[PDB]
Design a protein around this ligand. Structure first.
Ligand SMILES: O=c1[nH]cc(CO)c(=O)[nH]1
Length: 196
DNA sequence: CAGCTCTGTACGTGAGCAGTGGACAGCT
DNA sequence: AGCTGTCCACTGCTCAGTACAGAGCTG
């Protein structure tokens, strides 16, 4: 029990999006974990690498935590949402129909607020997104920038290893910070390309 | 064959948990 | 000196996607 709160109550709770217009980066998670539904803030996981990586990469220049997520769009130009809204312990608990439904809601949200870069916090969710939205399944899907903008916009697609610490192939935040740094570089290259 | 899809399986860190016990002050 | 309770350092866990092999297919 999370301070008295049963796991049953948490499964029903949802995590509110934090979206505005003219954002640079929208961090797209998979779906709310237990701690996320409890706190009502994005990536509150004590082990989760998201915030540490936001700092080590200098995307935030100050060590923030989940409580500051609502202050991100104004200050740092970063917004939050997920592929699937339903709260589950994580990943494998969701169905294919749920993910693709989420993708529809997601691609819809993306072409509304249209940020500069749609950041997929997880390879898995982009595999589903790419196949559904772009009708394309590539043998060797790689991290980083993707060949397709979300339809009818100029929003780019950028994929990173999931900030979850369950990922054994990237054991530490140091092992993931590289993709955040190139995300920051991508952002800067886009701001400059526009300012020209 | 060879390719394609889907399922299951295995894998490293480090934060936080309960349990354990050593240090130690306040007693009698 | 012996007793004893609290405190706390430290223990030994557990647990928060991805790559890939192979099986069941199809071409
Ligand atoms: O990739 C991720 N990691 C963690 C979460 C939530 O805790 C999420 O939604 N997506």
């Amino acid at each position: 029990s999370f301070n008295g709160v049963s796991e049953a109550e948490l499964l029903t709770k949802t995590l509110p999006d934090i979206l505005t217009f003219n954002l640079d980066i929208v961090i797209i998670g998979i779906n709310p974990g237990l701690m996320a539904a409890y706190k009502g803030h994005h990536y509150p996981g004590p082990g989760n690498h998201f915030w540490k990586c936001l700092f080590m990469s200098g995307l935030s220049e100050v060590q923030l935590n989940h409580m500051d997520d609502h202050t991100l769009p104004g200050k740092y130009g970063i917004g939050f949402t997920n592929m699937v809204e339903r709260t589950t312990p994580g990943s494998k608990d969701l169905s294919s129909k749920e993910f693709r439904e989420g993708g529809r809601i997601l691609v819809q949200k993306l072409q509304k607020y249209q940020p500069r870069i749609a950041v997929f916090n997880g390879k898995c969710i982009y595999e589903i997104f790419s196949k559904e939205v772009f009708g394309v399944k590539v043998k060797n899907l790689e991290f980083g920038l993707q060949p397709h903008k979300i339809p009818d916009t100029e929003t780019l697609c950028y994929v990173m290893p999931s900030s979850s610490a369950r990922c054994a192939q990237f054991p530490r935040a140091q092992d993931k910070v590289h993709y955040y740094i190139k995300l920051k570089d991508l952002r800067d290259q886009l701001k400059g390309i526009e300012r020209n």
